[PDB]
Short mmCIF file of N, CA and C and ligand atoms in Angstrom, two decimals:
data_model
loop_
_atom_site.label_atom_id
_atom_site.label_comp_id
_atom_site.label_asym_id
_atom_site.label_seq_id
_atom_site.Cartn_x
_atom_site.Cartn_y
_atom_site.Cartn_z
N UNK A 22 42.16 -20.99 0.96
CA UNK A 22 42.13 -19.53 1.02
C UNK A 22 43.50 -18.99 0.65
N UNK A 23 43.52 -17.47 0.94
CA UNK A 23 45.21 -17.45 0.06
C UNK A 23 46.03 -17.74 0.67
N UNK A 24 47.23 -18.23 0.01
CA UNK A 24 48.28 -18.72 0.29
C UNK A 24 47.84 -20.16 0.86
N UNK A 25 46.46 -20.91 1.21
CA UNK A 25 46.37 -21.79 1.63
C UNK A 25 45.90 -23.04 0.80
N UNK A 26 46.84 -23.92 -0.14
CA UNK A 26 46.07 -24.40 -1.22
C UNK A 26 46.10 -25.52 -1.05
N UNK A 27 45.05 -26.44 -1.49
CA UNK A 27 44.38 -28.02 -1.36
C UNK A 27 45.16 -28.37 -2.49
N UNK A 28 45.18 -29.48 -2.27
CA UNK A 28 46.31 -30.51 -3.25
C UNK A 28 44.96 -30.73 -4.66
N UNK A 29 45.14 -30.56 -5.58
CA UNK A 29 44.07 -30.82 -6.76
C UNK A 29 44.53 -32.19 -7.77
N UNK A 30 43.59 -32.24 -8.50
CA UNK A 30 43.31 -33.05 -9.66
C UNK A 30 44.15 -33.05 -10.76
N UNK A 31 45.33 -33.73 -11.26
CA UNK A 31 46.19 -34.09 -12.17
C UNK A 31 44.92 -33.89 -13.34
N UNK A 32 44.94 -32.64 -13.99
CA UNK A 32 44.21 -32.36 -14.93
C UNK A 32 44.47 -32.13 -16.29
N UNK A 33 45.58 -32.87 -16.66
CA UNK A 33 46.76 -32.63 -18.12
C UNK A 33 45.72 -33.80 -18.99
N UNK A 34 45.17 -34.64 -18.46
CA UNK A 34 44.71 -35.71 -19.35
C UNK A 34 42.89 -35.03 -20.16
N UNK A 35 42.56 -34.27 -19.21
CA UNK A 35 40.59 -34.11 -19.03
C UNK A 35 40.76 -33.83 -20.94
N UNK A 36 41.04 -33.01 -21.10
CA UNK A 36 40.41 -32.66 -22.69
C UNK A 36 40.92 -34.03 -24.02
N UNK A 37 41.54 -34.67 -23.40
CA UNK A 37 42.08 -35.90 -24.63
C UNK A 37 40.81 -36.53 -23.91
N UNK A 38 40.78 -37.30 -23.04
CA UNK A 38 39.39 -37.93 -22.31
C UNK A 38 37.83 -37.23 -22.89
N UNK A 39 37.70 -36.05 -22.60
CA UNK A 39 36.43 -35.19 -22.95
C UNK A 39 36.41 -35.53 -24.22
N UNK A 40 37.40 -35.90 -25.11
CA UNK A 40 37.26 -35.80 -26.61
C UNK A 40 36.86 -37.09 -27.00
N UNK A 41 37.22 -37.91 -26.18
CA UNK A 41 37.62 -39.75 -26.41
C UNK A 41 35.87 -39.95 -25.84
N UNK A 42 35.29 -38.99 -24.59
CA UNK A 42 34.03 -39.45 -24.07
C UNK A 42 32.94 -39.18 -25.13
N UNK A 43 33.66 -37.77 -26.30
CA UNK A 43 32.45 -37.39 -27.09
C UNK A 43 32.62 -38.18 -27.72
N UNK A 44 33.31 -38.72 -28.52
CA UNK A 44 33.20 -39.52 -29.74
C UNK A 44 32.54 -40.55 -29.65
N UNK A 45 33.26 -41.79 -28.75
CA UNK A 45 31.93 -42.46 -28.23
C UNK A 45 30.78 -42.24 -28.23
N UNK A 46 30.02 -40.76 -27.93
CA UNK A 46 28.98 -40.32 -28.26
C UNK A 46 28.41 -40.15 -28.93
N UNK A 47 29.21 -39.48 -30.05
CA UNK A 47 29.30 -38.98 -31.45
C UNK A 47 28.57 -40.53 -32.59
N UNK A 48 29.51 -41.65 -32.07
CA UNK A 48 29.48 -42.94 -32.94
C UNK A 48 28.50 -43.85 -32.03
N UNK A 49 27.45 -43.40 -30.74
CA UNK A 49 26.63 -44.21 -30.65
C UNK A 49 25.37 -44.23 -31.37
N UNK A 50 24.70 -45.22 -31.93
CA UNK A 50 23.45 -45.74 -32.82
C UNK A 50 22.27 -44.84 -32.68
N UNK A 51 22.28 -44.22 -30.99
CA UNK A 51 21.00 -43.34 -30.62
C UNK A 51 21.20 -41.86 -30.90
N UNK A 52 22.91 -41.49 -31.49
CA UNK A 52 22.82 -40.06 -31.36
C UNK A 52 22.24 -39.24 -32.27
N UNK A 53 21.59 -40.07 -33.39
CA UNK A 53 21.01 -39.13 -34.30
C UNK A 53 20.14 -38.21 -33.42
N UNK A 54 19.65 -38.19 -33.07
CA UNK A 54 18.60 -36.80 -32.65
C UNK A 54 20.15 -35.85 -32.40
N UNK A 55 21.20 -35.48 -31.57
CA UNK A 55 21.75 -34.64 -30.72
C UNK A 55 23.08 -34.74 -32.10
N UNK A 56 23.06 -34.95 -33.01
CA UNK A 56 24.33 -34.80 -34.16
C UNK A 56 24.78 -32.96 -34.27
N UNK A 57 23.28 -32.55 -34.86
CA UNK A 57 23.34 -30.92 -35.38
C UNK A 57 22.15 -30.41 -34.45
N UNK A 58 22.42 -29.05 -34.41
CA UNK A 58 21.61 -28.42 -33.96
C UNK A 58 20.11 -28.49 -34.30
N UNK A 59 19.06 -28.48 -33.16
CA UNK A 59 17.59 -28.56 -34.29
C UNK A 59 17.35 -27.37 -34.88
N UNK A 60 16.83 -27.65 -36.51
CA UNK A 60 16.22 -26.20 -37.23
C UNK A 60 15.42 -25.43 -36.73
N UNK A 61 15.66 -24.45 -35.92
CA UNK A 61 14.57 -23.56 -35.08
C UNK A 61 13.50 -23.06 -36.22
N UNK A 62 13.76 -23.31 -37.48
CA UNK A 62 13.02 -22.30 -38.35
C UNK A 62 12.00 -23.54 -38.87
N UNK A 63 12.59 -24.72 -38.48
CA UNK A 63 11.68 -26.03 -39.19
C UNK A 63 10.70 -26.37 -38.21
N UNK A 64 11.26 -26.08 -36.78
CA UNK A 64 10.70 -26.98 -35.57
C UNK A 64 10.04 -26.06 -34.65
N UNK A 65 8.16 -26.34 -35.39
CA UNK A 65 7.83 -25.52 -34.60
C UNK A 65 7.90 -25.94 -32.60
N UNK A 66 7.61 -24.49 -31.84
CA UNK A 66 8.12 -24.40 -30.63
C UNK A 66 9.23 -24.22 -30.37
N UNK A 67 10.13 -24.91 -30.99
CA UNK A 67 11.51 -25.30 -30.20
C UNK A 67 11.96 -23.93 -29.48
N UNK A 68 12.01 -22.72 -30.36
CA UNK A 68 12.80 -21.47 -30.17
C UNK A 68 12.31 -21.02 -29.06
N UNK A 69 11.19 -21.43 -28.83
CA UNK A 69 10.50 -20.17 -27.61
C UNK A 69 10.55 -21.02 -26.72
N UNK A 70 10.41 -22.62 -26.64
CA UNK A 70 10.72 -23.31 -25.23
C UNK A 70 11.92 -24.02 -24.84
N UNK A 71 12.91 -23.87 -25.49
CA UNK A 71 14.15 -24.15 -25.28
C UNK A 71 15.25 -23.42 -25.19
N UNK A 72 15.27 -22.48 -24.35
CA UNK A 72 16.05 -21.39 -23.88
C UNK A 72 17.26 -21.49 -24.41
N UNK A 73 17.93 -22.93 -23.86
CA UNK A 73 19.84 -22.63 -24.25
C UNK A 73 19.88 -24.04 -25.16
N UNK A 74 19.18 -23.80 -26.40
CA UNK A 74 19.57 -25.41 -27.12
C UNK A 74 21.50 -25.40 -26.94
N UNK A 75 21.28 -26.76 -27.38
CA UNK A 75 22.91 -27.54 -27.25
C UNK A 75 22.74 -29.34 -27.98
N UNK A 76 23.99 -29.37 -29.00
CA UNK A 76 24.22 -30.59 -29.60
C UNK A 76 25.45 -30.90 -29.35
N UNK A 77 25.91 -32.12 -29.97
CA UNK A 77 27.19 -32.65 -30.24
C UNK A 77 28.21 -31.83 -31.10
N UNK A 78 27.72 -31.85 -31.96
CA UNK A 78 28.73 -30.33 -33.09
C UNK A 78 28.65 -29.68 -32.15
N UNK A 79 28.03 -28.70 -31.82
CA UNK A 79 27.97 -27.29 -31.36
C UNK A 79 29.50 -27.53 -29.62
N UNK A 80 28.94 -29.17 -29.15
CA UNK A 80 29.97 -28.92 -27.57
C UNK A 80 31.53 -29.46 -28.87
N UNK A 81 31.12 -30.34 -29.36
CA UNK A 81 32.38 -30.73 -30.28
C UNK A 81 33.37 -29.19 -31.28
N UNK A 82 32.93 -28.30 -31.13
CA UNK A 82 33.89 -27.33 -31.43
C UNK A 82 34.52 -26.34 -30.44
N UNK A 83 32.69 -26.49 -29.88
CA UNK A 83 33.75 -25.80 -28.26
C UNK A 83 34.72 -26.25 -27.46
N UNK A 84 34.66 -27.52 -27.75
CA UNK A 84 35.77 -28.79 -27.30
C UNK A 84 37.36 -27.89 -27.59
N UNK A 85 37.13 -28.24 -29.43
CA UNK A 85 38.20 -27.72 -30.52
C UNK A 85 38.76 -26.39 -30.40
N UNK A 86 38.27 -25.63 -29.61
CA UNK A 86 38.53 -23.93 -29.67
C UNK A 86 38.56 -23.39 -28.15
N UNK A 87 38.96 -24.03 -27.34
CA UNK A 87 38.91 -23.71 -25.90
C UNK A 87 38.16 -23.41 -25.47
N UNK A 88 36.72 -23.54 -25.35
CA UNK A 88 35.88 -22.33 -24.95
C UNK A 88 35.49 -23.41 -23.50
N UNK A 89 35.80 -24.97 -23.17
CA UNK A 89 35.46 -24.57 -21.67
C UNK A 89 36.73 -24.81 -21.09
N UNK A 90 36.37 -24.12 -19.94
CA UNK A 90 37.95 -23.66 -18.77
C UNK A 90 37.88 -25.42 -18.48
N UNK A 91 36.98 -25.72 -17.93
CA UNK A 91 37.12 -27.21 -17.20
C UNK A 91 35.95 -28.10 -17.62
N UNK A 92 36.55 -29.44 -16.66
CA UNK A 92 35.71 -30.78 -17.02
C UNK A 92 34.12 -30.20 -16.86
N UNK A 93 34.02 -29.86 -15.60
CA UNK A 93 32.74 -29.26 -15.53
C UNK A 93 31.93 -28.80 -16.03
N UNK A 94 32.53 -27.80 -16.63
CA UNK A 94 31.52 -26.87 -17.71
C UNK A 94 31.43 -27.83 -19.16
N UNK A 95 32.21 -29.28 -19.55
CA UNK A 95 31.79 -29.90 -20.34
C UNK A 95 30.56 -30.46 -20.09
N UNK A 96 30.49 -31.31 -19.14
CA UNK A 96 29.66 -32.08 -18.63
C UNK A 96 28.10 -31.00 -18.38
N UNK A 97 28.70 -29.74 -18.06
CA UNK A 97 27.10 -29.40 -18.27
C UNK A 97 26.25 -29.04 -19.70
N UNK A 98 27.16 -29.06 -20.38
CA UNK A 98 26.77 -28.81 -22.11
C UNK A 98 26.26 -30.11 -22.21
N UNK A 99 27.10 -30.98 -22.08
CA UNK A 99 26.50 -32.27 -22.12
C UNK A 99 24.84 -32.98 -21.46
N UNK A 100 24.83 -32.66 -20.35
CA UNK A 100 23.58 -32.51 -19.50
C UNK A 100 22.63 -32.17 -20.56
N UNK A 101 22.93 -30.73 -20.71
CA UNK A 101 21.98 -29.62 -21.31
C UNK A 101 21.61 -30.44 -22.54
N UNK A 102 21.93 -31.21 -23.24
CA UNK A 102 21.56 -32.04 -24.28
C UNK A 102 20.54 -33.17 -24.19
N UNK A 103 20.56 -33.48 -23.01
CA UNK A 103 19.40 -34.74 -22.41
C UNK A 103 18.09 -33.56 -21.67
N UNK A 104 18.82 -32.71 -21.07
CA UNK A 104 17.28 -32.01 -20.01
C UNK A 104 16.69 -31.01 -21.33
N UNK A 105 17.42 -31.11 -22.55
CA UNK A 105 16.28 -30.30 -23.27
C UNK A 105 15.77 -31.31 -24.16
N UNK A 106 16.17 -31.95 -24.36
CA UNK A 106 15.56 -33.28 -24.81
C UNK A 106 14.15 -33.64 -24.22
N UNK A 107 14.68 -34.02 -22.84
CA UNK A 107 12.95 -34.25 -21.86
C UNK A 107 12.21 -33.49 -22.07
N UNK A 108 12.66 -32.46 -22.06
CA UNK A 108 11.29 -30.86 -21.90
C UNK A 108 10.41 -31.17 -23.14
N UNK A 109 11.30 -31.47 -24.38
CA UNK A 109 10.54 -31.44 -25.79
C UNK A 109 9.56 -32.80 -26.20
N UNK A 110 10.34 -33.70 -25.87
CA UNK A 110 9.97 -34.95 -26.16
C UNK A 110 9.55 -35.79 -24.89
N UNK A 111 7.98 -36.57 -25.49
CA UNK A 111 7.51 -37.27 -24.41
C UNK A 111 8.80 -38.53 -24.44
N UNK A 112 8.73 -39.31 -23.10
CA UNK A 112 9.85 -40.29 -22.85
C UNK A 112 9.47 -41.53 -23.51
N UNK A 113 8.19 -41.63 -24.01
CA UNK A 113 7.93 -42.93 -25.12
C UNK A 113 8.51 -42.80 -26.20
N UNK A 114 8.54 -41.50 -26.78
CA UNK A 114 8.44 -41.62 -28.18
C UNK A 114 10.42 -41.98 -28.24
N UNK A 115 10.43 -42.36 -29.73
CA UNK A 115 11.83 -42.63 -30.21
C UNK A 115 12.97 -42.00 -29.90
N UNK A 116 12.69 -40.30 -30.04
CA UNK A 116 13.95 -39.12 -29.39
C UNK A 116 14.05 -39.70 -27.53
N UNK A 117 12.80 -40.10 -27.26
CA UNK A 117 12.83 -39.18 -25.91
C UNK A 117 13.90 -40.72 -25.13
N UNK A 118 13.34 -41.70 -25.49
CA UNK A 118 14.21 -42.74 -25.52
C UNK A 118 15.51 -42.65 -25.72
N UNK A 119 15.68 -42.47 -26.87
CA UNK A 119 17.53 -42.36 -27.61
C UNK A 119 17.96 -41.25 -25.92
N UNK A 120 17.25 -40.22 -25.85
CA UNK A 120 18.25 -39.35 -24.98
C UNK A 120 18.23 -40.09 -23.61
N UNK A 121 16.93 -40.93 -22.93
CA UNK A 121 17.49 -40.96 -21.69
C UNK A 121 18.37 -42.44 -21.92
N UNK A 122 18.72 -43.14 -23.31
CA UNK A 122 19.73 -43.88 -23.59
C UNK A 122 21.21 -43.27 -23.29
N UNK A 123 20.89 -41.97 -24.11
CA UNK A 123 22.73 -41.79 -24.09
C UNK A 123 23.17 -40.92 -23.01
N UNK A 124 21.90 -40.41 -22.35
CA UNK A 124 22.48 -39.86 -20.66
C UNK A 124 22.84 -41.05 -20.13
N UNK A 125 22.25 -41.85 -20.32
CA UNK A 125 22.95 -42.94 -19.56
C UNK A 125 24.07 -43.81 -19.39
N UNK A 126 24.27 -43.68 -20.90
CA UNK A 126 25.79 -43.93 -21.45
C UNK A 126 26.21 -42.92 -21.37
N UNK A 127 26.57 -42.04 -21.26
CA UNK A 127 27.68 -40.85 -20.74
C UNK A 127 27.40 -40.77 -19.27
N UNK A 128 26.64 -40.82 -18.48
CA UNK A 128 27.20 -40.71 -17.33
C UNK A 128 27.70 -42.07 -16.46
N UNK A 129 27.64 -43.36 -16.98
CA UNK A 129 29.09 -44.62 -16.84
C UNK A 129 30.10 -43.86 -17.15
N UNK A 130 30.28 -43.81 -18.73
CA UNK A 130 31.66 -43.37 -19.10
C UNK A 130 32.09 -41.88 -17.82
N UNK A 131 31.68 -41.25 -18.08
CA UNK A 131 31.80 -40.09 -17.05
C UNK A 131 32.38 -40.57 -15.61
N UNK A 132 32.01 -41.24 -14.73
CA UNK A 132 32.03 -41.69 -13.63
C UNK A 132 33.29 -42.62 -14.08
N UNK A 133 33.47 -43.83 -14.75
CA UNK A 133 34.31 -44.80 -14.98
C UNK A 133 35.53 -43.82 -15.30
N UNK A 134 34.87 -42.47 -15.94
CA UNK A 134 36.74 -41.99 -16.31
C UNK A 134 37.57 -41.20 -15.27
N UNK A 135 36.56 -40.30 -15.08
CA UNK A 135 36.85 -39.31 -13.36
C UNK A 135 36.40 -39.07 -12.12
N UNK A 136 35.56 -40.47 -11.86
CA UNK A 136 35.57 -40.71 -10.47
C UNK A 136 35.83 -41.76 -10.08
N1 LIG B 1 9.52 -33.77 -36.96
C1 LIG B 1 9.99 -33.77 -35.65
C2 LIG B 1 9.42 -34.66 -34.70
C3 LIG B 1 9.87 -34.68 -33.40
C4 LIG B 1 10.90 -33.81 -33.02
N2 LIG B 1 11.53 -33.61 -31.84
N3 LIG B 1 12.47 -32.63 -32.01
C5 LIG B 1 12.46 -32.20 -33.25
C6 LIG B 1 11.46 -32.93 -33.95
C7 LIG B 1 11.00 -32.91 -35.27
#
């Protein structure tokens, strides 16, 4: 509370890390589906049932241009890339696979880096 402050998180390293966690991402075998944004104009549904799409480009510039304050708000862009994944794709088919692959590999790396 004010004037009363908790000792915090040595946070000088998070965005070289956030960058080092995407790439890894970026260069795993399953990320083709989550590279570019999907063509809303190609893919029917997508627009009307996927409220807040999100890819790799799209968090990879927000990365580049400050747009999140903290680790946190990476990690939920990141999220947001697997839970719209599920919504669209059954978990057999090839996408739906690749994503609950690379949620899974990002949240090791995630945990192994900052917790
Ligand atoms: N053609 C095709 C098939 C499956 C898909 N999941 N998301 C986009 C998309 C496009």
């Amino acid at each position: 509370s004010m004037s009363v402050k908790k000792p915090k998180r040595d946070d000088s390293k998070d965005l070289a890390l956030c960058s080092m966690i995407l790439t890894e991402m970026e260069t795993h075998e399953d990320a083709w589906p989550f590279l570019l944004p999907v063509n809303l104009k190609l893919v029917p549904g997508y627009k009307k049932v996927i409220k807040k799409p999100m890819d790799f480009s799209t968090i990879r510039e927000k990365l580049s241009s400050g747009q999140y304050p903290n680790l946190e708000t990476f990690a939920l862009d990141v999220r947001l890339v697997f839970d719209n994944c599920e919504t669209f794709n059954e978990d057999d088919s090839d996408i739906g696979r690749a994503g609950h692959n690379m949620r899974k590999y990002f949240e090791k790396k995630w945990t192994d880096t900052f917790k």
